[PDB]
């Protein structure tokens, strides 16, 4: 049903829609926490070994 009933608004520009939708996601440093935790993970791992 999904692959046979897909439809969108008539005059759609993907770039505008995606950009307007993705804007709130990349708004803070939160997207970089994993980097810091990975760094600590490395140092902890080596020292333990």
């Amino acid at each position: 049903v999904a692959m046979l009933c897909g439809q969108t608004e008539t005059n759609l520009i993907p770039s505008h829609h995606y950009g307007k939708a993705f804007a709130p996601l990349f708004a803070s440093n939160a997207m970089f926490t994993r980097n810091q935790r990975a760094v600590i993970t490395r140092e902890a791992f080596v020292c333990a070994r």
């Binding site: 709130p24 939160a30 926490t33």
Partner: protein
């Protein structure tokens, strides 16, 4: 104007006169300090958050709110339904500021289906087919907004037109809810600092206040706490509460430029010189507490030198306890008594606290208070107050004025708090020892005590099996060791089920149907298995009980039966998260501790219930005088006679089922249970109370047992 965003903590007091106090009451100590802060945090916004809480994710909610300026100058202007709304532009023609045609207006008046045309093309009209953010975006513009629904967020919501159009279109309570917004605005002022519950973009002039306690679980925005905290953490924007007291803000403790040695920092100096003749001669529901850091030290070495020692954090000890005991900072008090036990006041501090942790890290520890540890501590010094705030107490751990049972593991220090503390005052009525129920009472009731009977059954087993069981219980790594322990458990369970349950069930009125009962039990199962209608609170104390009872040698068992019983009860207890017993103690004794700080005398009260003389005489009682007898169910205390009398006209919707035997053993029962929150927070209740005749000389002879029902009525007394 630096802004500090605030997220309330676990039991944040909200009905307080000033939101500021619940943050940290030290800020109110000095006029020179309290003048530097604004608060905002309006009620209308609070109500909106309460509603939308169930309909937005944390990320969405934060994303929506973060852009709003500090004083919200905009309003949401609700429009009435088109048939109603259209008449407004003709009732006042100049009010047709959009100049919608008269023909269209009266065409709407004629139509069976008045269309949205009257709304159509009106600038900044918000149809029901809109979303939360649509409002918030316009809120940043400061201008008022016109909406077609009540469920809106970000600005105070008020009627656009007089109430006549919205009437019928909306109902009474709905029509009522907008009244403060109809005349919403109030000014906001440019002081040095302004606290706010409204989030904001964290930056060079905005800070997140860190209190080091769990959030208010009920507060709708607590879900934002992690994201906010981590963002502040990664940019070093947290502020410990102490930083607020300094002349210039900086995140840190022990700064170079300030010694932080001033009366403002010392939270122990709680002072209340000002007055306003307000009805709250005292609000005994608001309790100031402190988190303190204390240094512990052992005996010095052979040359007078001493080890570095260790410092621990004690959480939320009530401050009046320390003040009334004249405790002062920077003083090295002796910790140990003559017999090596802790000095009483320290024990009270531990008992009424919420938790004890290592000062630096966040690891909670159960403190030992016996001869177990080598190089044991002998001196204690309080160093500083990490936090000092007022907290709401009303009905928090317990709910009913009737009674409450607290479960604690065997070996707790309940005796200290129930005896030494009231004895330390012994001048104001706190409780009646005849009303508190020791957890051991029923075990002592059997002609051979429950312990003796258990011992007598137990010895029939082989000694080696018992020896193996005891060792396994002590040795933590001895997982299960089924054989030895399970056998003992079977004997314990079989005996308890056999004898204790009927004996317990035979004391039902004694536990609940007295004036006000405080009871202890070794496990909630002790009550549930007997069907006793009393609230049970699963408490815990931050001290190691196992070692503690290992020091009590004068018992029926040679310290081995005790640990066996302890394990059995713990096994019997139901698995659930237990609460800190200090919170319950704070609810009961806390208000009393504030009595000596008061300036004016107390006023007694009670809610005596009548008793017709007919039934008494019919029961063979000899009584003088016709007027119906009355009996005091529970006494209370206030200090403002004016408001107290003003609050005495309420008729409690809780009947009393009084019962009394010929032996004058008197009992009370409230058919609708009496909840503590129903008590006005200006009152003050004793921890326990015993029902009694208001005038025992009226009766001349006790006939048979008597029961009757009557209403309840608060009244004065002299």
């Amino acid at each position: 104007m630096i802004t500090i965003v605030v997220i309330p903590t676990a039991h944040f007091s909200w009905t307080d006169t000033n939101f500021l106090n619940s943050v940290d009451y030290r800020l109110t100590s000095q006029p020179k300090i309290r003048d530097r802060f604004a608060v905002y945090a309006p009620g209308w916004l609070r109500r909106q958050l309460d509603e939308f809480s169930a309909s937005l994710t944390a990320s969405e909610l934060l994303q929506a709110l973060q852009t709003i300026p500090i004083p919200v100058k905009a309003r949401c202007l609700l429009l009435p339904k088109p048939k109603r709304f259209a008449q407004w532009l003709l009732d006042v023609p100049s009010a047709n500021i959009w100049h919608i045609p008269v023909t269209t207006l009266r065409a709407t008046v004629a139509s069976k289906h008045p269309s949205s045309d009257v709304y159509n093309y009106i600038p900044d009209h918000v149809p029901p087919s809109a979303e939360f953010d649509t409002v918030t975006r316009r809120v940043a513009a400061g201008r008022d907004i016109y909406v077609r629904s009540t469920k809106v967020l970000g600005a105070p919501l008020c009627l656009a037109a007089p109430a006549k159009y919205y009437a019928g279109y909306l109902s009474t309570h709905q029509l009522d809810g907008v009244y403060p917004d109809n005349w919403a605005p109030d000014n906001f002022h440019k002081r040095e600092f302004c606290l706010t519950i409204l989030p904001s973009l964290l930056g060079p002039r905005t800070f997140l206040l860190d209190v080091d306690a769990d959030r208010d679980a009920s507060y709708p925005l607590s879900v934002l706490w992690p994201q906010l905290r981590v963002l502040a953490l990664k940019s070093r924007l947290l502020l410990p509460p102490v930083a607020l007291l300094r002349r210039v803000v900086d995140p840190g403790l022990k700064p170079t430029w300030s010694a932080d040695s001033d009366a403002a920092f010392r939270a122990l100096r709680l002072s209340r010189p000002s007055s306003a003749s307000k009805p709250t001669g005292f609000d005994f529901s608001a309790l100031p507490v402190v988190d303190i850091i204390c240094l512990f030290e052992s005996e010095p070495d052979d040359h007078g030198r001493v080890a570095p020692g260790t410092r621990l954090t004690i959480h939320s000890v009530p401050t009046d306890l320390l003040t009334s005991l004249s405790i002062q900072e920077g003083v090295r008090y002796p910790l140990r008594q003559e017999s090596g036990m802790f000095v009483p006041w320290v024990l009270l501090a531990l008992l009424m606290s919420d938790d004890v942790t290592i000062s630096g890290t966040r690891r909670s520890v159960k403190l030992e208070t016996a001869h177990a540890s080598a190089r044991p501590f002998v001196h204690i010094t309080v160093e500083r107050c990490a936090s000092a705030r007022v907290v709401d107490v009303r009905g928090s751990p317990a709910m009913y004025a009737n009674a409450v049972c607290l479960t604690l593991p065997k070996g707790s220090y309940k005796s200290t708090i129930i005896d030494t503390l009231p004895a330390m005052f012994s001048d104001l009525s706190i409780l009646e020892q005849a009303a508190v129920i020791d957890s051991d009472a029923l075990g002592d009731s059997l002609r051979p005590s429950f312990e003796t009977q258990f011992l007598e059954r137990l010895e029939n087993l082989d000694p080696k099996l018992l020896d193996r069981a005891v060792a396994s219980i002590l040795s933590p790594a001895s997982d299960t060791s089924d054989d030895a322990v399970t056998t003992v458990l079977d004997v314990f369970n079989a005996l308890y089920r056999e004898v204790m349950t009927p004996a317990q069930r035979s004391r039902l009125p004694l536990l609940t149907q007295q004036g006000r009962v405080l009871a202890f039990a070794h496990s909630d199962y002790e009550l549930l298995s007997a069907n006793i209608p009393i609230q049970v609170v699963r408490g815990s104390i931050p001290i190691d009980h196992v070692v503690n009872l290992l020091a009590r040698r004068n018992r029926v068992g040679g310290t081995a039966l005790q640990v066996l019983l302890d394990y059995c009860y713990r096994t019997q207890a139901s698995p659930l998260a237990p609460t800190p017993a200090g919170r319950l103690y704070k609810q009961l004794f806390g208000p009393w501790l504030m009595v000596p700080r008061l300036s004016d005398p107390l006023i007694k009260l009670r809610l005596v219930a009548s008793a017709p003389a007919k039934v008494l005489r019919a029961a063979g009682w000899t009584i003088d005088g016709d007027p119906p007898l009355e009996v005091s169910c529970l006494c209370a205390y206030v200090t403002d006679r004016a408001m107290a009398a003003a609050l005495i006209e309420r008729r409690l919707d809780s009947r009393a089922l009084v019962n009394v035997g010929g032996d004058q053993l008197m009992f009370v029962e409230y058919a609708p249970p009496l909840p503590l929150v129903s008590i006005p927070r200006t009152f003050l209740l004793p921890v326990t109370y015993v029902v009694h005749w208001v005038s025992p000389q009226r009766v001349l002879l006790n006939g048979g047992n008597v029961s009757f029902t009557s209403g309840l009525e608060w009244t004065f007394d002299d």
